[PDB]
From a paper:
Lasalocid A, a polyether ionophore natural product derived from [name], is a widely used veterinary medicine that acts by transporting various cations across the cell membrane, thereby disrupting cation homeostasis. Lasalocid A biosynthesis entails two stereospecific epoxidation of the precursor diene, catalyzed by the flavin-dependent enzyme [name]. We performed protein engineering on [name] to improve its thermostability and catalytic activity. Screening of these mutants using thermal shift assay identified stabilized variants [name]-T189M, [name]-[name], and the double mutant [name]-T189M-[name].
We found that the Tm values of [name]-T189M, [name]-[name], and [name]-T189M-[name] were increased by 3.0 °C, 4.5 °C, and 4.8 °C, respectively. After incubating these proteins with trypsin for 45 min, the wild-type [name] completely disappeared, while some intact proteins remained for the three mutants, especially for [name]-[name] and [name]-T189M-[name]. The stability of the system is obviously improved by the [name] mutation, and the captured structure is almost stable in one conformation. In order to reveal the structural basis for the higher thermostability of the best two mutants, we solved the crystal structures of [name]-[name] and [name]-T189M-[name] at the resolution of 2.50 Å and 3.76 Å, respectively. Comparing the structures of [name] WT, [name]-[name], and [name]-T189M-[name], it can be seen that the angle of the α helix between L408 and T419 shifts, which is in agreement with the MD study. However, in the crystal structure of [name]-[name], a loop in this region turns to a helix, indicating the effect of stabilization. Furthermore, the loop region R314-L316, E208-F210 and C398-Q401 in [name] WT change to a β sheet in the two mutants’ crystal structures, also indicating that this region is less flexible and more stable. In wild-type [name], there is a hydrogen bonding network between S195 and D187, S193 and L199. Moreover, weak hydrogen bonds formed between S195 and L198, as well as Y319. After mutating from S195 to M195, the hydrogen bonds involving D187 and Y319 were removed and new hydrophobic interactions formed between M195 and L199, as well as V331.
Author numbering: 20 to 488
Amino acid sequence: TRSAVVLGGGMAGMLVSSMLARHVGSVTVIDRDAFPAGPDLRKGVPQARHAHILWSGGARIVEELLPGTTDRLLGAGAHRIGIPDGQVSYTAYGWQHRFPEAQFMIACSRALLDWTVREETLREERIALVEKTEVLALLGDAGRVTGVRVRDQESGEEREVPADLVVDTTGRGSPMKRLLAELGLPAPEEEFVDSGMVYATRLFRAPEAAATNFPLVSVHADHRAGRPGCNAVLMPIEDGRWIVTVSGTRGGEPPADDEGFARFARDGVRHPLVGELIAKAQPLTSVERSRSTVNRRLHYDRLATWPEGLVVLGDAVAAFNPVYGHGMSAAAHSVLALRSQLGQRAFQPGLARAAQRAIAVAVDDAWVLATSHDIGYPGCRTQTRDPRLTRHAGERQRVTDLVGLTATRNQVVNRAAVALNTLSAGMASMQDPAVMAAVRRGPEVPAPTEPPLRPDEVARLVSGAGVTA
Ligand SMILES: Cc1cc2nc3c(=O)[nH]c(=O)nc-3n(C[C@H](O)[C@H](O)[C@H](O)COP(=O)(O)OP(=O)(O)OC[C@H]3O[C@@H](n4cnc5c(N)ncnc54)[C@H](O)[C@@H]3O)c2cc1C
Ligand SMILES: [Cl-]
């Protein structure tokens, strides 16, 4: 009984289709893009060309909704990288000591992750993916949405798709503002923090002995310094390749050419470790850039009038600067918020409004983590009403900077630090007396003077060829 229509077949659309199919009779996914039969790039997801980090918070939710996805991803060549044991990060406060595993992350190409999730989601026959179809209008009125009017691209014909619930997961380019204006409702309050961050990505062939078991390598900017923030990340992906992403805010954007790419990885960031590593490897692709790095939040939950049976989640409601890697995990938490409101209110009046408020809560942690670090950079453009970002930004920063500094050299503080940053625990977990006691206990290890690389890791950066003696 009952039917749902999900707009957009990306990450959030697939995950919320898996969830909705367990609560309604049929789910119809509407997308304007063409979908490949294998782990391929497509025009509807241009961000798949760049490095994608799936934190434990998102991966655990994906595993719950689609059991077997993690093992399937690992079987295809993905890497399970422990945190912080398997990471080499020059943090804003110094090198992070590689304590034993507290959290984890999944490392694969975004194309492989999207194809794997879609294959598992579409095993349920009651979910239908309708490709290359435009979204014309929402059916119903400003009091209740009753479906969507769509148009096939090949024919141009228009049809009505009825639904008891319409979920918008069309991503950053969501047309929900227009779709709502044609419904008569005003525009939602728009919050954004624009640092001008620009991505630049190249693919590399890892040295043979390092195709397996290699750590995530990241060189971070110092968000407290008054210089443009530049980052460099090296992430192993399937099939023995390395995806290398460099980034910079306004006034320090990475170049588009191959020559300048390696120079940026060596001298554009605070430590040349990534630049040193890529020169052990064969480049495979040219530089591809992205400018989709604005933290943007649409407050649909606070509109005076909100229609029944209409829900927005994913990048359509809250997008973030990707250098913090919370986008996919935030959408996963949003899907669970909707699932929580379905278990509580079923399809009674008030579900859509209650779902929109829980979705706003579910993304607030990722929003704060991204925007609190982005506002400091030179040339930043901010439009906000949040006192955390405005009035109380100085006091909140003096505490996180103290937490972050201690987290590089204290295991229990690091435990809470990575639990929050992987979106596996809430903000309140940082106020537990057992964490603030460890912050007051100070460091338990010396600040590393070198990249905390393991000797067996660096040994696998060379073939060992040409030696017979
Ligand atoms: C460069 C970059 C790097 C990132 N790195 C990370 C990372 O490491 N970790 C992380 O967690 N997140 C990362 N993100 C964020 C993550 O990619 C997004 O948050 C995530 O894709 C959100 O899922 P979504 O389904 O809402 O959007 P998408 O995955 O983009 O899905 C959009 C879908 O809707 C369709 N669509 C779009 N417009 C319309 C329309 N008008 N009508 C119909 N269909 C439409 C598209 O064809 C597509 O299928 C990164 C983003 C970028 C740009
Ligand atoms: Cl992009």
